[PDB]
Design a protein around this ligand. Structure first.
Ligand SMILES: CCC1=C(C)/C(=C/C2=NC(=C\c3[nH]c(/C=C4\NC(=O)[C@H](C)[C@H]4CC)c(C)c3CCC(=O)O)/C(CCC(=O)O)=C2C)NC1=O
Ligand SMILES: CCC1=C(C)/C(=C/C2=NC(=C\c3[nH]c(/C=C4\NC(=O)[C@H](C)[C@H]4CC)c(C)c3CCC(=O)O)/C(CCC(=O)O)=C2C)NC1=O
Ligand SMILES: CCC1=C(C)/C(=C/C2=NC(=C\c3[nH]c(/C=C4\NC(=O)[C@H](C)[C@H]4CC)c(C)c3CCC(=O)O)/C(CCC(=O)O)=C2C)NC1=O
Ligand SMILES: CCC1=C(C)/C(=C/C2=NC(=C\c3[nH]c(/C=C4\NC(=O)[C@H](C)[C@H]4CC)c(C)c3CCC(=O)O)/C(CCC(=O)O)=C2C)NC1=O
Ligand SMILES: CCC1=C(C)/C(=C/C2=NC(=C\c3[nH]c(/C=C4\NC(=O)[C@H](C)[C@H]4CC)c(C)c3CCC(=O)O)/C(CCC(=O)O)=C2C)NC1=O
Ligand SMILES: CCC1=C(C)/C(=C/C2=NC(=C\c3[nH]c(/C=C4\NC(=O)[C@H](C)[C@H]4CC)c(C)c3CCC(=O)O)/C(CCC(=O)O)=C2C)NC1=O
Ligand SMILES: CCC1=C(C)/C(=C/C2=NC(=C\c3[nH]c(/C=C4\NC(=O)[C@H](C)[C@H]4CC)c(C)c3CCC(=O)O)/C(CCC(=O)O)=C2C)NC1=O
Ligand SMILES: CCC1=C(C)/C(=C/C2=NC(=C\c3[nH]c(/C=C4\NC(=O)[C@H](C)[C@H]4CC)c(C)c3CCC(=O)O)/C(CCC(=O)O)=C2C)NC1=O
Ligand SMILES: CCC1=C(C)/C(=C/C2=NC(=C\c3[nH]c(/C=C4\NC(=O)[C@H](C)[C@H]4CC)c(C)c3CCC(=O)O)/C(CCC(=O)O)=C2C)NC1=O
Ligand SMILES: CCC1=C(C)/C(=C/C2=NC(=C\c3[nH]c(/C=C4\NC(=O)[C@H](C)[C@H]4CC)c(C)c3CCC(=O)O)/C(CCC(=O)O)=C2C)NC1=O
Ligand SMILES: CCC1=C(C)/C(=C/C2=NC(=C\c3[nH]c(/C=C4\NC(=O)[C@H](C)[C@H]4CC)c(C)c3CCC(=O)O)/C(CCC(=O)O)=C2C)NC1=O
Ligand SMILES: CCC1=C(C)/C(=C/C2=NC(=C\c3[nH]c(/C=C4\NC(=O)[C@H](C)[C@H]4CC)c(C)c3CCC(=O)O)/C(CCC(=O)O)=C2C)NC1=O
Ligand SMILES: CCC1=C(C)/C(=C/C2=NC(=C\c3[nH]c(/C=C4\NC(=O)[C@H](C)[C@H]4CC)c(C)c3CCC(=O)O)/C(CCC(=O)O)=C2C)NC1=O
Lengths: 274, 162, 194, 172, 162, 172, 162, 162
């Protein structure tokens, strides 16, 4: 039932389903009380298209809750290829650029900071780019200037929860997944009492940020490689965070901007207080 | 979808087994038979228009009362949905001819037939009589093994409805 | 058998337990009949070894296999096939001639694979074996709501451990239970030295 | 399950139409080449064991890590599982080849499969390679058999290859 | 016993169903194929004597040591039981040819083969080499579809033994 | 399960022999008449419903006691069982007719059937008669069909009859 | 045979359990209800003759063509077997009334209905129309809870036929 | 992995039961037996090198022809893979000795043995003869209950291969 092979038999579109079952579907044949196996708390099964409506109806009745439906063939092509991003190409900005040096930087900051969503030409931050070109500001400010912009506020903040925002923030600004439940919490409390702007500053003035990017380096991916004071399970979070080269942050998804890192998963790396 | 090819493959798979001489002999039957089948298919295909109008009318001529007001052979929509339905049957007959088995008929018309007809107050008798008529006329469009094939599938539908 | 000990297979199982569950499932479904290594459903055993299917769904794959179709369906009368499916999948004898009739009508309307699914998706299968227990013979106990004649009929179907359900000799393909069921008349042949 | 005709029929039906004269003759051609197809399927069946064996010998010749302790084709139990999978895939490729359509291969075998191997710690790249070797030898046999009438089987050899290549791509 | 005829009937029966055009097309394959099959059968039948002596010897020529004392190709009884065994194989090949399927081979030689050979210390290699030789000589007794049939079944035995 | 060839093979094997030239040509003749055989099986399949229906109408025309209360084809449940058995027997007779051997009929249908009916109180003589009527109509159809090539099918009509007559004899 | 009494007993037995207050409360319903049921039963019983002739005729008045030659409402035997059949339905309705459940209807008319009607070319529409008519007239033979009971079972038959 | 300890625990678990005096008595057997087992293990461990070279050679001395060109006892790679394989067997024998059961042999050599040997054209006879030889020499490295243990497991492998 778990992770599948193959698709169809006569022909179908296999969908794999996931639920949470009562002892009504599955119980042991024991002398007392009806219980399902504790590890099949959420169970998944792959069903071809016709049997599918009948299965969902049954599951819902006898008590289960469907958690997901997704085609099997989507889910057979693995996990993302990460070769482009295991070790990236660094893009920095020199004192006295040749101009198109500066052209390189802007295109990359865009891609990285905005998480590969398209920024259309009406959309670009032109006055701010003027500033970088004249020196005036360094490659750090545009990383900070873009983040406080409406375009950044609008595709990533306004329409999703704070859990999601912060998780995106780590990916964009720091290039790495969020290590602890404390990190999520520490941030949510800051936004709540100092506002959005103070909270944005907190990733860009951090010691972690400063070491790796310094001030003239565009933030680049770095979570597919071992880092310091990183729990070990933050390397699996990175797969959940980045979905491949053609994937992007996208707020235009049918289901909306949502999570990607399970809250249960974060707790595995440690729980304390505050 | 049931064809000679899918059937032998299904039988091999279910015994965890490569196709053997038994199964390939079977397949040769289906391939040897394609010529007659496909001749029937082409004749039924180009005459479709008139085969359908012929059978539709025959349903009213055999059940005169259907065409009176308050009845189910009256008004543009009933008579339209009828032509369509016989056309569906002829369509799947040609598909079954081309496919080398009853699969298309089994999957798209037989599975569920009675439940649908019973909910919608559609008498099988009409459909049998549509098909009996189509069978009469196909007697002079084809002959030999193409006719036998056409007949095989028309009769298959009539038995599905009895 | 008194109460035969039913084999439960639990998660994070090494193999020896998986090999023991596979042997128990084969002994239950095919009786004491020899199975060649070329006749084993290696794909189903590999899916069970990988934890990708439950013991219930492994039994569904074995019961739908062409080997189970050749031994129990092509060689036997429909009523004896129903008597044997109740023996192999549910560990019991038929309670009433009406139960044999409902399975025979389902077989005639929906075909073979739907009859097999009707035993394995039964609330009786889930209540007694769940997903992880191999089916075991149950008709030697009185259960709440069980006919007293179910014990005698289970004993007629269960010729002891040395019994072959495929025996072509003058009684093994004949309905041992159906002769009695229709009415008031009898008991089960004990092969009769017991 | 689909075959090449059934596929035609499904596409026609989605238009609400009797098969196009286009589609009719494409299928007339499949019937035209069907004796060759039967020989091609027969080439694989008649040498299944050697195709698997020879692929195998060569896979472990290349990847001697699989047969060391720590390796995914060690000990006997795992080697038997690996030999079994080679057979299963060769089997569904032959079914697709009789059918003139990949669907039985994709639906009953491949497409997924990758996620199984991922959980099994089975190195998918090695499995992909074993499939590439089966392809080489299988086609070898399709092209050079016992007293078959001489002609051109390249169309069928290509099609067989795409089934081997589907499986490889799906798994790696 | 597996033949095209028994297979289609089995598949009908198990769905509680009359034989339909799918199943009769299949049967026509088996009947159309009988001529080539039965020509192979007649040629293998009359050459049996020499095909057997040829293959028996080839087992000793390929495994020279078998014919030394203390070995299993020595003495009248081993060499007698060998000829007999190859004769059994050729016999079932002719039966499979005549029957239209592998049934006779499956039921009388394949079911149980390895257990028997393993208990009696009989190496499959001999039997494969007997069959490889029989396959070499049958190249010039037959041709066309009779040869393909003969080959199909000889190869089927060789795969059963690997 | 046996067919006419398989039967030959079993008898040959019991002698320890390759098939006799006697037996070979008997089987060559079965292949000779096989198109006719296919039409004969097709005649039954193509009219199964009417064969059962017409047999039925006539059975109850003759034996009006079966459809009275107290009668074995009353109420609807029992009539449906009786109609179902008529179909089952016609089915296995058609299988035997494709096979050229009665064994599937005797082994899967007739074996134990009489004792079943007696246990049930089903009047076997009435069941035998229903089988005789199916025979009349079935053969009717085998002999007078849609645009089949004109020839002599009496050998096959006889053989079909013996399958109907086996069933009748076995049951009465 | 399904009655309130048999149902509660079945449910107890299947849990290996004595009848408890739940099951005895249920039984009281069936016993409290007997008076209305049995009044309906007596009225349907004595009017049977005319209820049957009324419904038989109405089948011909609603399907005029049935009474023409070559049709299934023609000749003494068809018209005789029709009266009988409606009489069977009314009989089982009275039984279901008296029994306290649908059992008699389920076991003697519903189980198998469609298969029989389909083999014999009997349209449910007739039978629905017979029953619709019987329902019209039973409006003035009964009232209150006896009418509700009569209705319950007549409607149950009409749904069985749709 | 089958040991006396795992077996009794498995049997308890499957009846939902604490270990009782039956199961602890069993365990004491396994623990009492460890001394003889582990002496066999140490002797087989340090002599491994020569036990392997002795058995490898004996395979060639008993099957002389293996060492000729074109054969499977020829060239560095065959002869290397042979030594390795016998070494695998001795290794698992020592493991089974130390573990208190056949588990290591069952899981790492027996499960799958025949399929592998059959695909790779490896005759069990060689391996039996390797083991028969190892059994001959282990007669003078051990005695008493350590020898009985060594024997138990060597013989277990020989039966697995027959
Ligand atoms: C593999 C061996 C195994 C374990 C360990 C197991 C645990 C387990 N405990 C369960 C329920 C339960 N477990 C408890 C236990 C407790 N309640 C409390 O308040 C206490 C804190 C605690 C006792 C110390 C309760 C109350 C339920 C029933 C929950 C409910 O149905 O509401 C269930 C649900 C099925 C059932 O109710 O039978 C499972 C599967 N099942 C197993 O098969
Ligand atoms: C707990 C009580 C219970 C419910 C409610 C239930 C629902 C249910 N409906 C199902 C299928 C189905 N349900 C429908 C229903 C519909 N199709 C339409 O187009 C309409 C919109 C609608 C009818 C109004 C259809 C068509 C299927 C079959 C889907 C398929 O197999 O393709 C299935 C899959 C299993 C099966 O096909 O038997 C379940 C479990 N099952 C249960 O056990
Ligand atoms: C809690 C302490 C801790 C551990 C243990 C840890 C493991 C870990 N290893 C990772 C990647 C990696 N680990 C390796 C390691 C190897 N590649 C090989 O071929 C060898 C077999 C092996 C070295 C012996 C490689 C190559 C990657 C990068 C994978 C990729 O991006 O493609 C990642 C993804 C994030 C990243 O790339 O930085 C994590 C989280 N992370 C942690 O925070
Ligand atoms: C894919 C195969 C397929 C078939 C065969 C099919 C039959 C079919 N016929 C229908 C209706 C119909 N069928 C007819 C048939 C007729 N009316 C007459 O004048 C004649 C008496 C007769 C033609 C012989 C009528 C009148 C309706 C409308 C029924 C209604 O909605 O009241 C409907 C209901 C949905 C609808 O209103 O279209 C289905 C599903 N549907 C399918 O998808
Ligand atoms: C639908 C048809 C079908 C396929 C394709 C299939 C694949 C499949 N391969 C499996 C295991 C396996 N597959 C292999 C295969 C390999 N090992 C290697 O190192 C090589 C790269 C490769 C051989 C070329 C191995 C070694 C295992 C056992 C893994 C383990 O248990 O550790 C399993 C787990 C169940 C089992 O072990 O029986 C499945 C389900 N199962 C199926 O039912
Ligand atoms: C359909 C409802 C039903 C009935 C009535 C029933 C009777 C029944 N009683 C049994 C045993 C038994 N019955 C008794 C009863 C008695 N011993 C005495 O000395 C007394 C005279 C008497 C008590 C008043 C005993 C002692 C056994 C066990 C016999 C044995 O195993 O040695 C058994 C064998 C199975 C078992 O032991 O569970 C059945 C089937 N089973 C049923 O399912
Ligand atoms: C409880 C333990 C147990 C025993 C003892 C047992 C015996 C037994 N032997 C059988 C068959 C058989 N037994 C033999 C044995 C022999 N043939 C000869 O000629 C020799 C005289 C003899 C060997 C020494 C043969 C040949 C068959 C197959 C008979 C047939 O199918 O025609 C069968 C029928 C099922 C099957 O074929 O698998 C059973 C049940 N079954 C069991 O479960
Ligand atoms: C038992 C199932 C079955 C099989 C296997 C079968 C084979 C078969 N292959 C044929 C032809 C042939 N088969 C091939 C095949 C090949 N040519 C080559 O050079 C390649 C090495 C090989 C590629 C696959 C060719 C070229 C012909 C002649 C052209 C044709 O008939 O299409 C013919 C026509 C007669 C003939 O020319 O010999 C038959 C009947 N018929 C059957 O009923
Ligand atoms: C119906 C199909 C069927 C087959 C295929 C069959 C094989 C078969 N071969 C046997 C023995 C034998 N088979 C051989 C074979 C050979 N000796 C040689 O010189 C060659 C190396 C080789 C021939 C290639 C030998 C020597 C024996 C005697 C084995 C013994 O009893 O020690 C036996 C043991 C019973 C007996 O001693 O006759 C069987 C069952 N039996 C069957 O019933
Ligand atoms: C192997 C293929 C096969 C056959 C042949 C078969 C016969 C068969 N007929 C049965 C019943 C029946 N058979 C009939 C048949 C008739 N009643 C009459 O009055 C007529 C004389 C006759 C029709 C021509 C009736 C009425 C019953 C139901 C008896 C009852 O339950 O009272 C039953 C009892 C189970 C059931 O009712 O479904 C079996 C097993 N079952 C099978 O699986
Ligand atoms: C789809 C499965 C399938 C069928 C059904 C089939 C029938 C079939 N029947 C044939 C002949 C025939 N069929 C009959 C049959 C009859 N003659 C009569 O007068 C009787 C009414 C009837 C008795 C059964 C006769 C007489 C011939 C011509 C002689 C012959 O070819 O044997 C022929 C040879 C071509 C021809 O002459 O038309 C075919 C192909 N072929 C197939 O592949
Ligand atoms: C116990 C419950 C029970 C029911 C309900 C029942 C119905 C029933 N109606 C039948 C026939 C019949 N039913 C009718 C019905 C009618 N003819 C007309 O004039 C009207 C249109 C219509 C009445 C509304 C006709 C004409 C036949 C004769 C059919 C034939 O044999 O051709 C038959 C076939 C056996 C026979 O010929 O008697 C059954 C079983 N049988 C039962 O045992
Ligand atoms: C964990 C337990 C385990 C065992 C027992 C094992 C046996 C084993 N022996 C093999 C090959 C082999 N085994 C031998 C054996 C021999 N050659 C000779 O000179 C002698 C005749 C004989 C030694 C007595 C040979 C020659 C090969 C190479 C076969 C080939 O690839 O052609 C292979 C194929 C993979 C490979 O080539 O290494 C396996 C799996 N593998 C395991 O993992």
């Amino acid at each position: 039932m778990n992770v599948l092979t193959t698709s169809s038999q006569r022909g179908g579109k296999l969908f794999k389903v996931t639920m949470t079952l009562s002892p009504a579907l599955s119980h042991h044949p024991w002398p007392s009380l009806d219980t399902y196996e504790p590890s099949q708390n959420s169970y998944s099964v792959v069903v071809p298209l016709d049997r599918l409506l009948a299965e969902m109806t049954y599951i819902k009745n006898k008590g289960g809750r469907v958690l997901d439906i997704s085609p099997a063939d989507l889910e057979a092509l693995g996990p993302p290829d990460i070769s482009s991003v295991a070790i990236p190409l660094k893009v920095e900005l020199w004192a006295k650029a040749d101009v198109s040096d500066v052209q390189a930087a802007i295109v990359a900051a865009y891609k990285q900071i905005f998480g590969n969503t398209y920024v259309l030409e009406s959309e670009r931050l032109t006055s701010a780019e003027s500033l970088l070109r004249n020196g005036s500001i360094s490659v750090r400010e545009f990383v900070r200037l873009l983040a406080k912009s409406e375009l950044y506020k609008e595709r990533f903040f306004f329409c999703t929860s704070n859990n999601r925002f912060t998780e995106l923030n780590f990916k964009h600004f720091l290039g790495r997944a969020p290590y602890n439940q404390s990190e999520i919490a520490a941030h949510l409390d800051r936004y709540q009492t100092f506002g959005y702007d103070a909270e944005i500053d907190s990733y860009i003035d951090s010691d972690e940020y400063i070491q790796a990017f310094g001030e003239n380096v565009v933030p680049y991916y770095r979570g597919f490689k071992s880092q310091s004071g990183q729990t070990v399970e933050s390397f699996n979070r990175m797969f959940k965070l980045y979905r491949g080269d053609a994937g992007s942050d996208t707020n235009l998804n049918l289901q909306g901007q949502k999570r990607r890192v399970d809250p249960k998963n974060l707790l595995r790396s440690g729980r304390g207080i505050v | 979808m049931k064809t000679v090819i899918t059937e032998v493959i299904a039988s091999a798979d279910s015994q965890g087994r490569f196709l053997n001489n038994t199964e390939l002999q079977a397949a040769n039957g289906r391939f040897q038979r394609a010529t007659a089948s496909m001749e029937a298919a082409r004749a039924l295909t180009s005459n479709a228009d008139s085969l359908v109008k012929g059978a539709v009318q025959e349903v009213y001529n055999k059940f005169p009362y259907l065409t009176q007001p308050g009845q189910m052979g009256y008004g543009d929509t009933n008579q339209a949905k009828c032509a369509r339905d016989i056309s569906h049957y002829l369509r799947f007959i040609t598909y079954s001819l081309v496919a080398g088995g009853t699969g298309p008929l089994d999957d798209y018309i037989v599975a569920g037939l009675r439940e649908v007809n019973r909910t919608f107050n559609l008498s099988p008798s009409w459909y049998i009589e549509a098909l009996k008529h189509i069978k009469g006329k196909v007697g002079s469009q084809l002959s030999g093994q193409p006719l036998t094939e056409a007949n095989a599938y028309i009769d298959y539908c009539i038995n599905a409805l009895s | 058998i008194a109460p035969d000990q039913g084999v439960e297979l639990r998660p994070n199982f090494t193999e020896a337990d998986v090999i023991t569950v596979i042997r128990a499932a084969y002994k239950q479904l095919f009786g004491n009949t020899y199975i060649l290594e070329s006749e084993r459903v290696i794909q189903a055993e590999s899916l069970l070894r990988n934890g990708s299917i439950s013991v219930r769904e492994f039994i569904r794959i074995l019961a739908k296999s062409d080997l189970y179709k050749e031994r129990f369906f092509r060689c036997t009368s429909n009523n004896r096939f129903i008597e044997l499916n109740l023996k192999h999948l549910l560990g019991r004898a038929p309670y009433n001639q009406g139960e044999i009739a409902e399975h025979l009508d389902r077989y005639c309307q929906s075909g073979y694979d739907a009859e097999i699914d009707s035993y394995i998706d039964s609330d009786e299968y889930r209540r007694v074996f769940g997903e992880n227990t191999v089916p075991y013979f149950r008709g030697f106990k009185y259960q709440v709501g069980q006919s007293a004649a179910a014990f005698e009929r289970m004993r007629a179907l269960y010729s002891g451990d040395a019994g072959s359900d495929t025996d072509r000799n003058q009684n093994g393909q004949r309905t041992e239970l159906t002769s009695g069921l229709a009415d008031p008349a009898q008991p089960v042949r004990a092969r009769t030295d017991y | 399950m689909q075959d090449a005709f059934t596929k035609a029929i499904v596409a026609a039906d989605l238009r609400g139409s009797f098969l196009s004269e286009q589609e009719l003759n494409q299928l007339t051609n499949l019937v035209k080449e069907s004796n060759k197809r039967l020989d091609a399927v027969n080439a694989i069946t008649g040498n299944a064991a050697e195709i698997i064996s020879d692929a195998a010998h060569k896979l472990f010749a290349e990847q001697t890590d699989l047969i060391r302790p720590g390796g995914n084709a060690y000990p006997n139990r795992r080697m038997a599982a690996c030999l079994r999978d080679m057979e299963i895939i060769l089997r569904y490729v032959s079914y697709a080849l009789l059918a003139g359509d990949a669907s039985v291969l994709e639906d009953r075998c491949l497409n997924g499969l990758k996620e199984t191997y991922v959980a099994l710690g089975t190195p998918t790249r090695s499995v992909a390679r074993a499939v590439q070797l089966m392809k080489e030898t299988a086609i070898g046999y399709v092209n050079s058999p016992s007293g078959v009438t001489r002609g051109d089987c390249s169309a069928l050899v290509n099609e067989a290859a795409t089934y081997f290549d589907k499986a490889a791509a799906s798994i790696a």
